[PDB]
Amino acid sequence: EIRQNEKISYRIEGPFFIIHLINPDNLNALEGEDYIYLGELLELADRNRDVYFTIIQSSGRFFSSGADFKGIAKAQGDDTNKYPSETSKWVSNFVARNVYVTDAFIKHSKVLICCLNGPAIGLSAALVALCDIVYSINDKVYLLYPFANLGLITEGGTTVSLPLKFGTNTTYECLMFNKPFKYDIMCENGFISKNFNMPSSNAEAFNAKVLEELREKVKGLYLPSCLGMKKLLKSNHIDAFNKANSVEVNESLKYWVDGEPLKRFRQLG
Amino acid sequence: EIRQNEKISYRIEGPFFIIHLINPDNLNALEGEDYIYLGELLELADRNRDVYFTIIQSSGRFFSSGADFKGIAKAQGDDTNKYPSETSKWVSNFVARNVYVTDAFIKHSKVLICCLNGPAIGLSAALVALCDIVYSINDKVYLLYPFANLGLITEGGTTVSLPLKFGTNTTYECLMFNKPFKYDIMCENGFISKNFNMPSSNAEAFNAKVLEELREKVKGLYLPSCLGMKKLLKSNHIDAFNKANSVEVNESLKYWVDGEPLKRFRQLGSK
Amino acid sequence: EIRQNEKISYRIEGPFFIIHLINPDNLNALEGEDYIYLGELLELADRNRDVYFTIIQSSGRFFSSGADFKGIAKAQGDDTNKYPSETSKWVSNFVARNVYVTDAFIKHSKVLICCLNGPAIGLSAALVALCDIVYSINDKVYLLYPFANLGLITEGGTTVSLPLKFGTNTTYECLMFNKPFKYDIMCENGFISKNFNMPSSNAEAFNAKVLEELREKVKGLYLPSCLGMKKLLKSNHIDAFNKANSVEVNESLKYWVDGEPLKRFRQLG
Amino acid sequence: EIRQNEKISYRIEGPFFIIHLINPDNLNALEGEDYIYLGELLELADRNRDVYFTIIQSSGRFFSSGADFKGIAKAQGDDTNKYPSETSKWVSNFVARNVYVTDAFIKHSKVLICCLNGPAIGLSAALVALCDIVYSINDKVYLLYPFANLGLITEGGTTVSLPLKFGTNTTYECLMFNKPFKYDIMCENGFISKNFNMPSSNAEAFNAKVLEELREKVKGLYLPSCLGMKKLLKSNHIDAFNKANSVEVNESLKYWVDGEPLKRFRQLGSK
Amino acid sequence: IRQNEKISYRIEGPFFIIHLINPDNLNALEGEDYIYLGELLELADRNRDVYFTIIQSSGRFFSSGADFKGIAKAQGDDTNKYPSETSKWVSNFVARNVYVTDAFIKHSKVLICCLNGPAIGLSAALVALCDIVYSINDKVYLLYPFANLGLITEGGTTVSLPLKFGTNTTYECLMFNKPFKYDIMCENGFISKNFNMPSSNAEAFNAKVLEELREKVKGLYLPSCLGMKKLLKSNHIDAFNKANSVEVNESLKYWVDGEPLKRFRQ
Amino acid sequence: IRQNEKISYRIEGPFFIIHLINPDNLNALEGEDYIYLGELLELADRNRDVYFTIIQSSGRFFSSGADFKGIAKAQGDDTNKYPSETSKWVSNFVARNVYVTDAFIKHSKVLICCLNGPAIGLSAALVALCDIVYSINDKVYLLYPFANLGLITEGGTTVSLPLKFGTNTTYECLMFNKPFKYDIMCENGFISKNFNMPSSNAEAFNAKVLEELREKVKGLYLPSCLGMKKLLKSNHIDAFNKANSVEVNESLKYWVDGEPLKRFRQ
Ligand SMILES: CCCCCCCC(=O)SCCNC(=O)CCNC(=O)[C@H](O)C(C)(C)COP(=O)(O)OP(=O)(O)OC[C@H]1O[C@@H](n2cnc3c(N)ncnc32)[C@H](O)[C@@H]1OP(=O)(O)O
Ligand SMILES: CCCCCCCC(=O)SCCNC(=O)CCNC(=O)[C@H](O)C(C)(C)COP(=O)(O)OP(=O)(O)OC[C@H]1O[C@@H](n2cnc3c(N)ncnc32)[C@H](O)[C@@H]1OP(=O)(O)O
Ligand SMILES: CCCCCCCC(=O)SCCNC(=O)CCNC(=O)[C@H](O)C(C)(C)COP(=O)(O)OP(=O)(O)OC[C@H]1O[C@@H](n2cnc3c(N)ncnc32)[C@H](O)[C@@H]1OP(=O)(O)O
Ligand SMILES: CCCCCCCC(=O)SCCNC(=O)CCNC(=O)[C@H](O)C(C)(C)COP(=O)(O)OP(=O)(O)OC[C@H]1O[C@@H](n2cnc3c(N)ncnc32)[C@H](O)[C@@H]1OP(=O)(O)O
Ligand SMILES: CCCCCCCC(=O)SCCNC(=O)CCNC(=O)[C@H](O)C(C)(C)COP(=O)(O)OP(=O)(O)OC[C@H]1O[C@@H](n2cnc3c(N)ncnc32)[C@H](O)[C@@H]1OP(=O)(O)O
Ligand SMILES: CCCCCCCC(=O)SCCNC(=O)CCNC(=O)[C@H](O)C(C)(C)COP(=O)(O)OP(=O)(O)OC[C@H]1O[C@@H](n2cnc3c(N)ncnc32)[C@H](O)[C@@H]1OP(=O)(O)O
C-alpha cells in the first residue's frame, strides 16, 4: 500500500514487480516528487518477499527526458519565501531527492531490469544505468547525460556507473562534450542484453514481450539463487556507489547556489 | 556575506574563523534550518583564504542537546498537507539537513577545533566527533548518542567516527545501551587534547582562554603547512565518512517513517 | 531446532540468545566439531527474529583453552587412510572448520556479547576478539594467542581483530613473542566494557549477573535500533575480515602440511 | 613429488608447467578430491623456481562439465553416519574444497594460461575465469554457470571475475537466467586472447599447437619480468577475490543445507 | 617555466597545448624531459583559464619512450658520482618516474592526447593516463616492451592497462611483448575518434583536432567538465597512487640487477 | 654493501642489527644515509637467516632527522647542475624519501627499533614504521616539526601517526608543532617496554635489549613470526603505499616554493 501516481503505475505479476512510467505526452519527465515516488516503489518491491525482479517500464517514444524543468522552475521564482537561503532551498529541492532515489536503486536487493522503450536523459538515464539488466526496443535508443550543457555535474552515481559500464575514456568524451551514449556504444559494451528490434511507436507491445519472455526465462530456475547471487554481485561497487552518491549530491549543490543550472534550465526548447 | 542566525554567530580574528552557538536558554538545541546554517558557515570558512582554523564554540552549561524536539514536532503534526507521504516528508526534513551538514564537516579543509563547554548529544555530538581537535572545559563533559533510545540509528558519520575515535567495543557498549562517552573514556582515548579544568558557569572565559592559547600556539608556524598536512590526513578515512554519510541518512529514513522516533521524541523531555 | 552438544548448551531468554560453554574439567577446549556447532548456533540465533543479543558464556576457571589437541591428534596417526594427502586432510580438518566458524562470527547480525569468566586461548580467544562487547569476571583474565609457539599463524581474523582492537604495535610484541594480552592491556584499550570483579571460582554466579544487568540495560531502548546500528557499524571492517579469513585459513594450511604444528601440539602439558 | 591422479596429469617442459585433464570419457568432471589435487598441482607449480607458466589443458570434446554429480550424490545419501549434521557435512565437503582450490588460483604467482578445448561449466568455468590468459580451440566454446538452475550461487570468485571480465550487465543477464557466456561475448570482451579455429575432435593437436606457439612467444623475453609484472597486476583485485572467496563459500553453505542443490543435481542429468 | 628544445607549449583560449617537437629522434625523451612535462602539467593545472591540456606530437611517432642514448649516459660515462648502484637508479629512474607519473595521475584539467603515431614505454604509459585519445590513422599502436627489456610495468600501467583494455587482453600483451594495436584500441573504446589522416602530416592532424575541440566546447559550462573529472578521478586515484609508488620501487631491483642495461645496449 | 662511516650493521644469529653510530652529530642523516638504510633493509630482507631487523643508535639521541647542513649543500653551493628547482628536489628529496620509506613499509622481517633518545622528522617517521619499539628511559619523544619547517607529513606519518596515536591526538601534535612525548607513547601502546636505563649509556641499553630478545625468541617457530607479519602487513600496506607516493609529491610544492630552505637556514 502506497499513494498513487498519475504519472507512474505499478503492478505485481508472479515474481515480477512492474514499475510503469505512464506519462508520454509530457515525455515521461519526472518532478522530484515522482523521483521520491520511484524510491518509494522500489522499497515496496524490495520489502515484498514474493518479488524477485523489479522491472522498470515506460511509455511513448522516450523512456524519460529526465528531470521536469517545469517542476524545477516552479521551485524558485514562484515562491521565494519559504527558504532562508538558496543553499537551504537546493538542499531540500535537489540534494535530498537525488540522494534518496539514487540510494533506493543502489541498495535494491532484487534484480532490476530496465526496458528502454526510447531514449533516457539526465537523472533518469542515471537510474537506467543503475539497473542490472537492460533490454532495448530498437536501435534508435540512447542515453544522454547533458551535465556540462546544464551547468551541473554527474548524478545518480554516474560518476561510478558510467565508466564502470561504458569505459573511463568513452565516458569522458561523452560527459565532457555533452555527447550521447548511442545504441552502438551500448551494444559494443554489452550494456543492452537484448534488442527486441521492435517499431519505435509500439512501446506497449514491446513492454509486454519482455515480460512474455521473462516468464519463460525464469521457468525452472531456483529464484532465491538469483537473489543470493545479486547479493554478492552487489558487493563489488556498493561502496564506490555509496561514496559517490553522497559526494555527487553535495558537490552539485554548489552549482545550484551559483545559479547557472537555473539560467540554463530556462531553455531549453 | 550570509543571512543572520539569531542562534549562531561568526567572526574572524586573523586566521581564526569562530562559530559561536549563542542560545543557552534552550541548551543550544539546533533546528533543521540551524544545522544547515552551520554548514553554510563552514563553507564560508572554507572559501575564505585567510582562514586556517574554524573554531566551533558554545554558550552556557551545554555544548548542544542536539536536534530540537520540539522543532521536530512542528515538522510533523502541525501541517500534514504539505508532503505527499511520510517518506517524502522525512527525505525533505531529515535526509536533506543531515546529509548536508555532515558533509560540510567531512570535507572541510581547515583545521577544525571544537570547544566542549558542556555535554553534546545526538547530531551535535556527531559534529563534535567530526572535528580535528577538541578541548574541554572541565571533567564533567560528555558525549551522548541516544539513538537506541530514540528509535534511531547512527548519524553524522558516527558509524565511522565513534569507533575510529573511541575504539569499537567501547562504541558498542555505548551506542547499543544508550550510555554516554563520559570524560574519562574521552581522555583515555586521547579524544580531548587538553582539558582546561574550568568551572561550568564561566564558559565565556573558557572560550576566551582557548582562543588566547591558540594565538600563542600558532606563532611562528607555517600555516599553509597545517592545511597541507590536514589534506593528507583527511584521505585516511575520507571515503569511509562519505560512504557512511549517504547510507546513514537513507537508512534512518526507514525509522522516521515507522514513526517510533516521533513517538519517542514526544515523551521523555516534558516534565 | 538443532543437535545437542554435551559440551555446549543454548537457551533463549527474552531478546537474548545464550550460548553456554559447559565443559569445565576439560577446560572448555573445543574440538573442530564443537567449533562448527558454535557456528551452527550463531546462525540459529541470527535467524531468530526475536533474538537481538547473542551472549556467549562459559564455565569454570577458563573461557576456553582453545582447540582440543586430543581432537587434533586423533585426526592424524589413529587413521591415516582416509585422505589422499596431508593437504587434503588439513583442508578438511583445519581449513574448512576455521573459515566456517570465523565467518559465522564475522557476519553475525545481532550484538555479540562475550562474558570472559577466565582466560581464553588460540581460536577461542580469536572468537572472543570477534564479539562486539566483552565483560570480564575479575582482573585475572587474559587472552593468549600462542601461534609462534605452536608453529602456526594468526587465525579467526586476528590478523584484523587483534591490532584493530589492541593496537598494531601491542599486537606485534604479543604475537611475535607468545606473550598474552593481559587484563591491564584490555582495560587500557577499552576492550573490556565492565569488570564485574567477582571471585575467580564463581563463573556461574557471574554469568547470571551479566544477564541480570542486561535485562535492565535494555529496558526502554528500541531494540531494532541496536540492530540497525550494528548493521552500519559492521561495514567498517567486514571486508578486511572477509579478506583476512580466506587468507589466514589458507596460509596456515602450509604450516600443517610441513608438519610442525603437530610436533608442537603433541605437548604440550 | 605428489600422489598420482588417474584423472589429472602434470609435466614440465622448460619453463612451462603443464596440467592436463585426461578423462574425456566422463567430460573431465572433477570430484571434490580432484579440485583439491588441482590446487596441490598449482602449489607445486608455484614452488618450482624454473616454472614461469602454468598451462591448464584438457581432453576430448569438453574442457570440464564441472563438479561430479554423481560424486556429489555419493557424498550424501550413501553414508549418513559420518557427519554430525547437514552443516558439518557441507563444510567438510563443499566449503573445504571450494575455498582451497579457488585460493590456489587466486594467489598463484605464475602466468596462468587456460586452453579451452570445449565448454566449461560451474566451478570449472570459474577456474577458467581465474586464469590470466585463455586461448580457445574453435568458436563453439562457451562458459556456463548454472547456479540459479542448481539452487546455488556464485563460486570460484566469479562474483569478482565474471563482471571483472565480461562486464556487469552481461554477467547478470547470464547468471540470473542460466544463460551461457558464449564465444562471441568472450571474443567481444577480449576474454579469449586467440582462437585457434581448430576442429573439435582434435583437442590433442590444439593442445600441442598452443604449446608450440608458447615456446616461440617466450623467445628472447626476460621471464622474471613476466613474473614481476604479474605480481603488480595481481594487486589490482587480489583483495576482492580474497573477500569474495571466503564469503562465496560460506554463503553457498546455507543452500546445501536447505537441500535444493541435491534435489536438483539429482534430476536433469539422467536420461 | 624554462625553455625545452624538444617540448614547446602554447595556450589557446582554455586549451593548454603541449607539442613534442623533436621528430627526427622519434620524440624519445630523457628523464629530464619527463620532469619537464610534469612541470608543464603543473602550469596547466594552476592556470585558472585552462580547462583542457592537449598533448600533441610530431612526425611519424608520438614518442618511442625513454631516450636509450641517455640511459647509457647515466652509466657508463660517469660512475663516480653515486655511492651505490641502488642510489644511482633511485635518482635517475625512481625519482623521475614517480614525479612525472604523479603529475598525470593528479592533473585536474581534461587531459586529451593526440596520438599522431605509435607510443612506446613510459610515453605510452602516459597516453593511457590521458582522459581522451584521438588518433591520426589506423596505423597507430601502443607498445609496452617491459618483458623484452628486463623491466616491469610503469606510469601506472599496472592499474591503467587492465583498466582500459581488460585484464586478460593486458596479460597477452604485457607477458609476451605484443603491442596493443589500433583494432584493440578501438575495441576497448580507448580511441574516441580516428581522424583517418595521412601519416605524412601530423601537423595537419593536430590543428584539425583543435578545430574540432573548439567546436565541441561551444556553449558548454566549462567548470562542469572540471567538476565532473574531480568526481570521475576518485574511482581510481587511490589505486593509481598505490600503483605509482610500488611500480617505481619494484623496478629498482631490475635496474640494480643489470638486465635493462644489458638489454638496452642492443 | 658498501661501508658507511655513520651506520654500521652486524648479524647475530637471526638478528640483523643496524647501529647508527655518529652521536656527536645527533645521528642526523643525509639523503644518501637514508638510501643506505633502505639498502641495508634490502640485505636484511633477502637474508633467509634473519628474522628480526634491529635498528639501534648512539649517545643522547636516536636521530634528529635530516642533516640540515646537507640540505644547504644541495642548494646554494652548486646550482648548475639542475635545469629547474622542481628537478632539484625531485632528485634530492622526492627520490630519497620514496625509496627509504618504501623500504621500511615493505620489509618482511620483524622490525624492532631501540629508541635510545629522541627521534625527529624523517628518522621519527621511520620509528613509527617499526613493528616494535623499546625505549631507554621516560625522557624520549618523537617530534614531527613539519608545521614549523614549512613542510608536510613524511615517511608515511600520514597513515602511521593517526594509526598509532589516534586521529585527534595526531592533529594537536602535527598542526601545532608539539612532540609526542613519552607519556602519550606509552598511553597509545607505541612503546612495548621501557628499560628505565640511564640516558648516559645508550650502549648498555642496546646490549640489554638484545639480551632480552634472544631470551624472548627461545623455542619459538621463527617462520611463524614471519608468516604472521605477512598477514599483519596487509591491514595497511595499501594505505601506506598511496601515502608514500602522494606524501613525496605534495611536499615538492613546498620545497620548490622556498619556505623549508628559508626555515632551515635558522
Ligand atoms: C530531484 C530533482 C532532480 C533535478 C536534477 C536536474 C539534473 C537532471 O536530472 S538532467 C535531466 C533534464 N532533462 C533535460 O535537460 C532534457 C531536456 N529536453 C530535451 O534536450 C528535449 O525534450 C529533447 C531534444 C531530448 C527531445 O525533444 P523533442 O524530440 O523535439 O520533443 P519535444 O517537442 O521537445 O517534447 C514533447 C513535449 O514534451 C515536453 N517535455 C519533454 N521533456 C520535458 C522535460 N524534461 N520537462 C518538461 N517537459 C518536457 C515538451 O515540453 C513538449 O511539450 P509541449 O510541446 O506540449 O510544450
Ligand atoms: C536535521 C534534523 C536532525 C534530526 C535528527 C534527530 C536525531 C538526533 O540528532 S538526537 C538529538 C536529540 N536530543 C535529545 O534527544 C536530547 C534530549 N534532551 C535531554 O535527554 C535533556 O535536555 C537532558 C537530560 C540532556 C538535559 O536536561 P536538563 O539538565 O534537566 O535541563 P532541561 O530543564 O531539560 O533544559 C532546559 C530547557 O532547555 C530545553 N531543551 C533542552 N534540550 C532541548 C532540545 N533538544 N529541544 C528543545 N528544547 C530543549 C528544555 O525544554 C528546557 O526548556 P523549558 O524548561 O523552558 O521548557
Ligand atoms: C578446527 C580446529 C582448529 C585448530 C586450530 C589450532 C590452533 C588454535 O586454535 S590454538 C588453541 C590451542 N590451545 C593451546 O595450545 C593451549 C594449551 N593449554 C595450555 O598452554 C594449558 O591448558 C594452560 C597452561 C593454559 C593451563 O593449564 P593449567 O592451569 O596447568 O591446567 P591443566 O592441568 O593443564 O588443565 C586441566 C585439564 O584440562 C585439560 N586441558 C586443558 N586444555 C586442553 C586442551 N586445549 N585440549 C585438551 N585438554 C585440555 C588438561 O589436559 C587437564 O586434563 P587432565 O589433567 O585430566 O589430563
Ligand atoms: C568441491 C565440490 C564442488 C561442488 C560445487 C557444485 C557447484 C558447481 O561447481 S556446478 C558444476 C556442475 N556441473 C553441471 O551441473 C553440468 C551438468 N552436465 C550437463 O548440463 C551435461 O553433461 C551437458 C548438457 C553440459 C553435456 O551433456 P551431453 O553433451 O549430452 O553429454 P552427456 O551424454 O550428458 O555426457 C557423457 C557422459 O559424461 C557424463 N558426465 C558429464 N558431466 C558429468 C558430471 N558433471 N558429473 C558426472 N558425470 C558427468 C555423463 O553422465 C555421461 O556418462 P554416461 O552416458 O556414461 O552415463
Ligand atoms: C626517467 C627515465 C625513464 C626510464 C624508464 C625506462 C623504461 C621505459 O620507459 S621503455 C621506453 C624505451 N623505448 C624503447 O625501448 C623503444 C626502442 N626503439 C625501438 O623498439 C625502435 O625506435 C622502433 C622499432 C620502435 C622504431 O624504429 P624505426 O621505425 O626502424 O626507426 P629508427 O631508424 O630506429 O629511428 C630513427 C632514429 O631515431 C632514433 N631513436 C628512436 N627511438 C629512440 C630512443 N628511444 N632513444 C634514442 N634514440 C631513438 C634512432 O636511434 C634513429 O636515429 P639514428 O638512425 O640517427 O641513429
Ligand atoms: C632525503 C632528504 C630528506 C629531507 C626531508 C626533510 C624533512 C625532515 O626529515 S625533518 C628532520 C630535520 N630535523 C630537524 O629539523 C631538527 C633540528 N634540530 C634541532 O630542533 C635540535 O638538534 C634539537 C633542539 C632537537 C636538539 O639540539 P640540542 O639538544 O641543543 O643539541 P645541539 O647543540 O643543537 O646539537 C649538537 C650538535 O649536533 C648538530 N646537529 C644536531 N642535529 C643536526 C641536524 N639535524 N643536522 C646537522 N647537524 C645537527 C648541531 O649542529 C651541533 O653541532 P655543533 O654544535 O658542533 O655545531
Q: Residue by residue, what is the 3-state secondary structure of chain D?
A: CCCCECCEEEEEECCEEEEEECCHHHCCCECHHHHHHHHHHHHHHHHCCCCCEEEEECECCECECCECHHHHHHCCCCCCCCCCCHHHHHHHHHHHHHHHHHHHHHHCCCEEEEEECCCEEHHHHHHHHHCCEEEECCCCCEEECCHHHHCCCCCCCHHHHHHHHHCHHHHHHHHCCCCCEEHHHHHHCCCEEEECCCCCCCHHHHHHHHHHHHHHHCCCCCHHHHHHHHHHHHHCCHHHHHHHHHHHHHHHHHHHHHCHHHHHHHCCCCC
Provide the 8-state DSSP code for E76.
I
Experimental method of this PDB entry: X-ray
Handedness of CA B171, B174, B178, B181 (dihedral sign): negative
For this experimental structure, what is the resolution in angstroms?
3.3
Which positions in chain D touch A191 (Cβ < 8 Å)?
167, 169
End-to-end CA distance of chain B: 41
F19: left (phi over 0), alpha (psi -120 to 50) or beta: beta
Nearest-Å Rg of the Cα atoms of chain E is 18
Q: Report the gap between the CA of E138 and the closest CA in chain F (Å).
A: 36
Which one, of B20, B19, B21, B22, lies nearest residue B48 by Cα?
Answer: B19
Provide the 8-state DSSP code for B67.
B
Residue with cell 610515453: E123
Q: Are F96 and E90 in contact (CB under 8 A)?
A: yes
Which positions in chain D touch E151 (Cβ < 8 Å)?
225
| Degrees, nearest 5: CA angle D176-D178-D180 | 120
In chain C, residues preceding a discontinuity (C to N beyond 2.5 A) are none
Residue with cell 555479540: C112
Instruction: Name the H helices within F107-220.
Output: 121-127, 146-149, 157-165, 167-176, 182-187, 202-216
- Examine the residue annotation and report whether F211 is marked as an active-site residue of this protein: no
Which one, of D141, D142, D143, D135, lies nearest residue D200 by Cα?
Answer: D141
β-pair type (A111-116, A53-57): parallel
Are residues A37 and B253, on separate chains, in Cβ contact within 8 Å? no
Which positions in chain F touch E248 (Cβ < 8 Å)?
98
The phi, psi pair for F155, rounded to 5°, reads: 50, 40
Q: Does C40 touch chain D (CB under 8 A)?
A: yes
String of DSSP letters for B130-199: HSSEEEESSTT-EEE--HHHHT----TTHHHHHHHHH-HHHHHHHHTTT--EEHHHHHHTT-EEEE----
| Degrees, nearest 5: CA angle F168-F173-F175 | 90
The phi, psi pair for B168, rounded to 5°, reads: -80, -55
Residue with cell 635545469: F83
> Active-site residue among E12, E39, E85, E154?
E154
Give CA separation, F109 vs B70, E251, F98, in Å: 60, 21, 20
Crossing angle for the helix pair B238-258 and C223-234, nearest 10 degrees? 160
For residues D241 and D237, what is the distance between their CA atoms, to the nearest angstrom? 6
Q: Are A200 and A215 in contact (CB under 8 A)?
A: no
Q: Are E50 and E44 in contact (CB under 8 A)?
A: yes
Which one, of A43, A123, A35, lies nearest residue B253 by Cα?
Answer: A43
Count the residues in chain E. Answer: 266
Residue with cell 531502548: C221
For residues A28 and A21, what is the distance between their CA atoms, to the nearest angstrom? 7
Give CA separation, F251 vs E50, E240, F121, in Å: 24, 18, 14
For F36, half-sphere exposure in the C-beta direction (CA atoms, 13 angstrom radius) is: 19
Which one, of A251, E80, C238, A12, lies nearest residue D250 by Cα?
Answer: C238
Q: Does F239 touch chain B (CB under 8 A)?
A: yes
Which one, of D159, D58, D64, D59, lies nearest residue D113 by Cα?
Answer: D58
10 Å Cβ neighbour count for C267? 7
End-to-end CA distance of chain D: 41
Please list, residue by residue across F246-264, b when 16 or more beta carbons sit within 10 angstroms of its beta carbon and e when fewer do.
Answer: bbbbbbbebbbeebbbebb
Nearest-Å Rg of the Cα atoms of chain D is 18
For residues D257 and D88, what is the distance between their CA atoms, to the nearest angstrom? 10
Q: Take atom 52 of ligand 6 and give the residue whose Cα is closest.
A: F25
* Interface test with chain D among C246, C251, C256, by most D beta carbons within 10 Å: C246
Are residues A251 and E232, on separate chains, in Cβ contact within 8 Å? no
Q: Which helix (H) or strand (E) holds B267?
A: none
Q: Which helix (H) or strand (E) holds C220?
A: none
- Closest ligand, as measured to the CA of D158: 4
For residues F7 and C261, what is the distance between their CA atoms, to the nearest angstrom? 39
And the C-alpha cell for B199? 568551572
> Active-site residue among D155, D213, D216, D260?
D155
Q: Say which amino acid occupies E196.
A: N
Which positions in chain A touch B243 (Cβ < 8 Å)?
239, 242-243, 246
Q: Are A115 and A53 in contact (CB under 8 A)?
A: no
- Closest ligand, as measured to the CA of D252: 4
D267: left (phi over 0), alpha (psi -120 to 50) or beta: beta
Handedness of CA C259, C263, C266, D3 (dihedral sign): positive
CA trace torsion B203, B207, B212, B217 (10° rounding):
120
Which one, of D116, D102, D86, lies nearest residue D253 by Cα?
Answer: D86
Residues 6 or more apart whose Cβ sits within 8 Å of residue E170: D233, E161, E162
Instruction: Name the H helices within chain A.
Output: 32-47, 69-73, 86-90, 96-107, 122-128, 147-150, 158-166, 168-177, 183-188, 203-218, 223-234, 238-258, 260-265
- For residue F17 and ligand 6, the question of a CB distance below 6 A is answered with no
String of DSSP letters for A169-200: HHHHHHHHHT--EEHHHHHHTT-EEEE----T
Q: Are D159 and A236 in contact (CB under 8 A)?
A: yes
Which one, of C255, C240, C113, C139, lies nearest residue C196 by Cα?
Answer: C139
CATH label of the domain that carries residue D266: 3.90.226.10
For residues A81 and C171, what is the distance between their CA atoms, to the nearest angstrom? 59
Interface list for C 188-207 with B (CB within 8 A): 189-194
- For residue E15 and ligand 5, the question of a CB distance below 6 A is answered with no
Which positions in chain E touch A176 (Cβ < 8 Å)?
110, 131-132, 225, 228-229
Handedness of CA B55, B58, B63, B69 (dihedral sign): negative
- For residue C7 and ligand 3, the question of a CB distance below 6 A is answered with no
Give CA separation, E229 vs A129, A154, A261, B265, E233, in Å: 19, 9, 18, 43, 6
Q: Say which amino acid occupies B209.
A: K
For E110, half-sphere exposure in the C-beta direction (CA atoms, 13 angstrom radius) is: 28
Which one, of E209, E156, E179, lies nearest residue E19 by Cα?
Answer: E209
Strand partners, B5: B8
C:D CB pairs within 8 Å: 87
Q: Are B140 and B200 in contact (CB under 8 A)?
A: yes
Give CA separation, F75 vs E81, F67, F82, in Å: 17, 13, 10
Residues 6 or more apart whose Cβ sits within 8 Å of residue A62: A24, A27, A28, A117, A118, A119, A120
Distance of CA A93 to the CA centre of its chain: 18
Which one, of C46, C1, C62, C19, lies nearest residue C211 by Cα?
Answer: C19
- Residue E64 three-state SS: coil
* Interface test with chain F among E1, E7, E46, E86, by most F beta carbons within 10 Å: E86
For residues B211 and D45, what is the distance between their CA atoms, to the nearest angstrom? 66
Which one, of D39, D194, D182, D23, lies nearest residue D103 by Cα?
Answer: D39
User: Could you tell which of C7, C35, C36, C65 is best to mutate to test the pocket of ligand 3, judged by most ligand atoms within 8 Å of the CB?
Assistant: C65
Residues 6 or more apart whose Cβ sits within 8 Å of residue C83: C89, C92
Q: Does A231 touch chain D (CB under 8 A)?
A: yes
Provide the 8-state DSSP code for B26.
G
Q: Does F175 touch chain B (CB under 8 A)?
A: yes
10 Å Cβ neighbour count for C219? 7
Are residues F172 and B133, on separate chains, in Cβ contact within 8 Å? yes
Q: Report the gap between the CA of B194 and the closest CA in chain C (Å).
A: 19
> Active-site residue among A31, A40, A155, A248?
A155
D255-261 — which CB contacts under 8 Å span 24+ positions?
Answer: D255/A225, D255/A228, D255/D151, D255/D152, D255/D153, D256/D86, D256/D90, D256/D94, D257/D86, D257/D87, D257/D90, D258/D151, D259/D86, D260/A222, D260/D151, D261/D72, D261/D150, D261/D151, D261/D152
Atom of ligand 4 nearest to the CA of D70: 47
| Degrees, nearest 5: CA angle F123-F125-F129 | 110
Strand partners, C8: C21
Q: Are C158 and C144 in contact (CB under 8 A)?
A: no
- Residue F12 three-state SS: strand
Residue with cell 534488442: A195
- Residue A164 three-state SS: helix
Q: Which residue of A has its CA nearest to D237?
A: A236
Give CA separation, E150 vs D46, E98, E265, in Å: 21, 19, 12
- Residue A266 three-state SS: coil
Nearest-Å Rg of the Cα atoms of chain A is 18
Q: Which domain holds residue E76?
A: 1-266
For residues C152 and C158, what is the distance between their CA atoms, to the nearest angstrom? 13
Q: Say which amino acid occupies E109.
A: K
- Chains in touch with B (≥3 Cβ pairs < 8 A): A, C, F
- For residue E96 and ligand 5, the question of a CB distance below 6 A is answered with yes
String of DSSP letters for C34-89: HHHHHHHHHHHHHH-TT--EEEEE--TT-SB-SB-HHHHHTTTTS--SS-SSHHHH
Instruction: Name the H helices within C93-182.
Output: 96-107, 122-128, 147-150, 158-166, 168-177
Which one, of E208, E178, E214, E173, lies nearest residue E193 by Cα?
Answer: E208
For E73, half-sphere exposure in the C-beta direction (CA atoms, 13 angstrom radius) is: 10
Q: Are A42 and A79 in contact (CB under 8 A)?
A: no
For residues E19 and E210, what is the distance between their CA atoms, to the nearest angstrom? 12
Q: Are E228 and A176 in contact (CB under 8 A)?
A: yes
Q: Which residue of D has its CA nearest to A234?
A: D159
Atom of ligand 5 nearest to the CA of E155: 9
10 Å Cβ neighbour count for A181? 26
For chain B, how many structural domains are there in total?
1
Provide the 8-state DSSP code for C221.
S
For residues D240 and E89, what is the distance between their CA atoms, to the nearest angstrom? 34
Helix, strand, coil distribution of chain E in percent, nearest 5: 55, 15, 30
For residues B96 and B93, what is the distance between their CA atoms, to the nearest angstrom? 6
Q: Which residue of D has its CA nearest to A132?
A: D169
For residues F16 and F35, what is the distance between their CA atoms, to the nearest angstrom? 17
For residues B260 and B238, what is the distance between their CA atoms, to the nearest angstrom? 32
Crossing angle for the helix pair B158-166 and B168-175, nearest 10 degrees? 120
Which one, of A72, A58, A68, lies nearest residue A23 by Cα?
Answer: A58
- For residue F144 and ligand 6, the question of a CB distance below 6 A is answered with no
Which positions in chain E touch A264 (Cβ < 8 Å)?
221
For residues F160 and F138, what is the distance between their CA atoms, to the nearest angstrom? 22
Q: If 0-12 CB within 10 Å is exposed, 13-18 middle and 19+ buried, where does residue A209 land?
A: middle
And the C-alpha cell for F59? 649517545
Atom of ligand 5 nearest to the CA of E34: 1
Nearest to B178 among C134, C221, C228 (CB): C221
Strand partners, F61: F58
For B243, half-sphere exposure in the C-beta direction (CA atoms, 13 angstrom radius) is: 18
Which one, of A100, A97, A105, lies nearest residue A19 by Cα?
Answer: A105
For residues E74 and E10, what is the distance between their CA atoms, to the nearest angstrom? 31
Q: Say which amino acid occupies F168.
A: N
